[PDB]
């Protein structure tokens, strides 16, 4: 009469324990790397530490809770709710952490000269504390009354041998599907994910527009120099230098680059004064000495600004993979709940698929340290130093 339940149960428990060990070790290493390396002690990494803490808690608490809830043991319904809903608190803390990293990177690309004064460590710690408080409120909403404890499965409870106030502790019997689909999936997971997608698109658009603008100014400085060399009128040299001066002051918006631009503006003002006095050849020769400033200062500034923007793109690509990996690990479990709720004429997904979807969502607490080690050089080197010594 069907295979013994302990056979498939033993497979699930061994696999979950294997995930718990890898979720603890890997994320402990992340926290430790940020702790000892001062180069990783930025506001961006305080949210990654919060994300690493939620993943440590998955291995220490959410997985032992998941193994417990699969037995269907008799328990007080509110206690059963805490066992089933605690993982939702950790998941909600993870989406807030991911959303804060995305906004932080958008502030760093849109207003870098205002980033340090706006995004401070003390303000970051305050955001994390408020977000952990809200994660508890959202994740434990069934404990406030939105649960099936009021309407228990009397048949399954008497067969299990449960006493007064006790229920056969099974997730789908205590947590309502309308909460899981509408409140937890649609409003608390899907809406913030779509927002993160929007924010990352705005980061890639800003970097592209800014890079195109740097090349536009560089071309304007070169093609206008060619116009002066080919000029035969006092107006032609004046019109080319006026457009050159506007590009020089726009690109101006360490002290070596600030000084380098002041000599360039100074040389343009020298040639423009000669152009207004009618001296065509003296203005052309004065505009030729701009080539010396271009090679010694302007080319070095353009190259430095380009590398910083390329570094920001590569960094935003790495953190976007993290958001994609969270979606890939949590969407199957969310999509099966949609089928259970919206399709009552459809057969319930098989038990093996349910526990495969639960296992896949838990492997997300193992992947992040690998992405840091493969995509972020600063994390990779700190990991190597910790492992080699200790």
Ligand X SMILES: CC(C)CCC[C@@H](C)[C@H]1CC[C@H]2[C@@H]3CC=C4C[C@@H](O)CC[C@]4(C)[C@H]3CC[C@]12C
Ligand Y SMILES: CCCCCCCC/C=C\CCCCCCCC(=O)O
Ligand Z SMILES: CCCCCCCC/C=C\CCCCCCCC(=O)OC[C@@H](O)CO
Ligand U SMILES: CCCCCCCC/C=C\CCCCCCCC(=O)OC[C@H](O)CO
Q: Which residues bind ligand ZMA (CB under 6 A)?
A: 87-88, 170-172, 180, 333-334, 337, 351, 354, 358
Task: Establish if 186 lies at the interface with ligand Z (CB under 6 A).
Answer: yes
Residue of closest CB approach to ligand X: 79
Interface residues with ligand Y (CB under 6 A)?
5-6, 8-15, 17, 19, 22, 64, 67-68, 70-71, 73, 351-352, 355-356, 359-360, 363, 366-367, 370
Which option in ligand ZMA, ligand X, ligand Y, none does residue 338 bind, with CB closer than 5 to 8 A by kind? ligand X
Interacting positions 330-359 with ligand X (CB under 6 A): 331-332, 335-336, 338-339, 342-343, 346-347, 349, 353
Residues 6 or more apart from 33 whose CB is under 8 A from it?
Answer: 40, 379, 382, 383, 386
Contact present, 250 and 268 (Cβ < 8 Å):
no
d(CA 340, CA 349): 8
Tokens standing for residue 169: 């502790």
Interacting positions 60-119 with ligand U (CB under 6 A): 64-65, 68, 73-76, 79, 82
- DSSP assigned state of 119: S
Least distance from C-beta 333 to ligand Y, angstroms? Answer: 13
Paired with 74 in beta bridges are 168
**Pick 184 or 365: Cβ nearer ligand Z:** 184
d(CA 362, CA 381): 27
Q: What totals of helices (H) and strands (E) does the chain contain, helices first?
A: 18, 2
Query: Widest CA span of the chain, in angstroms?
Result: 105
Q: What is the DSSP string of 121-135?
A: HHHHHHHHHHHHHHH
Which option in ligand ZMA, ligand U, ligand Z, none does residue 172 bind, with CB closer than 5 to 8 A by kind? ligand ZMA
Pick the closest to residue 206 from 71, 69, 87, 102 (CA basis). 102
Q: Which helix (H) or strand (E) holds 219?
A: helix 191-230
**Pick 348 or 384: Cβ nearer ligand X:** 348
**Pick 194 or 254: Cβ nearer ligand ZMA:** 194
Q: What is the DSSP string of 245-298?
A: HHHHHHHH--HHHHHHHHHHHHHHHHHHHHHHTT-HHHHHHHHHTHHHHIIIII
Least distance from C-beta 347 to ligand Y, angstroms? Answer: 13
Length of the chain: 390
Q: Total residues contacting ligand U (rule CB under 6 A)?
A: 10
Task: Establish if 338 lies at the interface with ligand U (CB under 6 A).
Answer: no
**Pick 176 or 332: Cβ nearer ligand X:** 332
Which option in ligand Y, ligand Z, ligand U, none does residue 210 bind, with CB closer than 5 to 8 A by kind? none
Tokens standing for residue 139: 């994740």
Tokens 């409870």 belong to which residue?
A: 157
How many Cβ atoms sit within 10 Å of the Cβ of residue 28? 15
Q: Which of 130, 191, 249, 328: binder of ligand Z (CB under 6 A)?
A: 191
**Pick 1 or 345: Cβ nearer ligand X:** 345
Tokens standing for residue 19: 């995930």
Least distance from C-beta 168 to ligand X, angstroms? Answer: 12
Which option in ligand Y, ligand X, ligand Z, none does residue 191 bind, with CB closer than 5 to 8 A by kind? ligand Z
Which option in ligand ZMA, ligand Y, ligand X, none does residue 8 bind, with CB closer than 5 to 8 A by kind? ligand Y
- DSSP assigned state of 347: P
d(CA 368, CA 25): 12
Q: Which of 54, 56, 83, 162: binder of ligand X (CB under 6 A)?
A: 83
Which option in ligand Y, ligand U, ligand ZMA, none does residue 82 bind, with CB closer than 5 to 8 A by kind? ligand U
Chain contacts with ligand Z (rule: CB under 6 A) = 182, 186-187, 191
């Amino acid at each position: 009469d069907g295979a013994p339940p302990i056979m498939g149960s033993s497979v699930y428990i061994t696999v979950e324990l294997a995930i718990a060990v890898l979720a603890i070790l890997g994320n402990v290493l992340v926290c430790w790397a940020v702790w000892l390396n001062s180069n990783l002690q930025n506001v961006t990494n305080y949210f990654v530490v919060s994300l690493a803490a939620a993943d440590i808690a998955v291995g220490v608490l959410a997985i032992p809770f998941a193994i417990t809830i699969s037995t269907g043991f008799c328990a007080a319904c509110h206690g059963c709710l805490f066992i089933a809903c605690f993982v939702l608190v950790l998941t909600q803390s993870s989406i807030f952490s991911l959303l804060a990293i995305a906004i932080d990177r958008y502030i760093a690309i849109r207003i870098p000269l205002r980033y340090n004064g706006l995004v401070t460590g003390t303000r970051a710690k305050g955001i994390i504390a408020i977000c952990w408080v809200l994660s508890f409120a959202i994740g434990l909403t069934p404990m406030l009354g939105w649960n099936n404890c009021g309407q228990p499965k009397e048949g399954k409870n008497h067969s299990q041998g449960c006493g007064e106030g006790q229920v056969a502790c099974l997730f789908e019997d205590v947590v309502p599907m309308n909460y899981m689909v509408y409140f937890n999936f649609f409003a608390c997971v899907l809406v913030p994910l779509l927002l993160m997608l929007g924010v990352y698109l705005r980061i890639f658009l800003a970097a592209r527009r800014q890079l195109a603008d740097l090349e536009d100014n560089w071309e304007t400085l070169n093609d206008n120099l060619k116009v002066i060399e080919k000029a035969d009128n006092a107006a032609q040299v004046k019109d080319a230098l006026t457009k050159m001066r506007a590009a020089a002051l726009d690109a101006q918006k360490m002290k070596d680059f600030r000084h380098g631009f002041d000599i360039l503006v100074g040389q343009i003002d020298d040639a423009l004064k000669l152009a207004n006095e009618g001296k065509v050849k003296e203005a052309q020769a004065a505009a030729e000495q701009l080539k010396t400033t271009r090679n010694a200062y302007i080319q070095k500034y353009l190259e430095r600004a380009r590398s910083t923007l390329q570094k920001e793109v590569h960094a935003a690509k790495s953190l976007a993979i993290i958001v994609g990996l969270f979606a890939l690990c949590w969407l199957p479990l969310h999509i099966i709940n949609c089928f259970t709720f919206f399709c009552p004429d459809c057969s319930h997904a098989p038990l093996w698929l349910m526990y495969l979807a639960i296992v896949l969502s838990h492997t997300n607490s193992v992947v992040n340290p690998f992405i840091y080690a493969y995509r972020i050089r600063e994390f990779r080197q700190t990991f190597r130093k910790i492992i080699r010594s200790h």
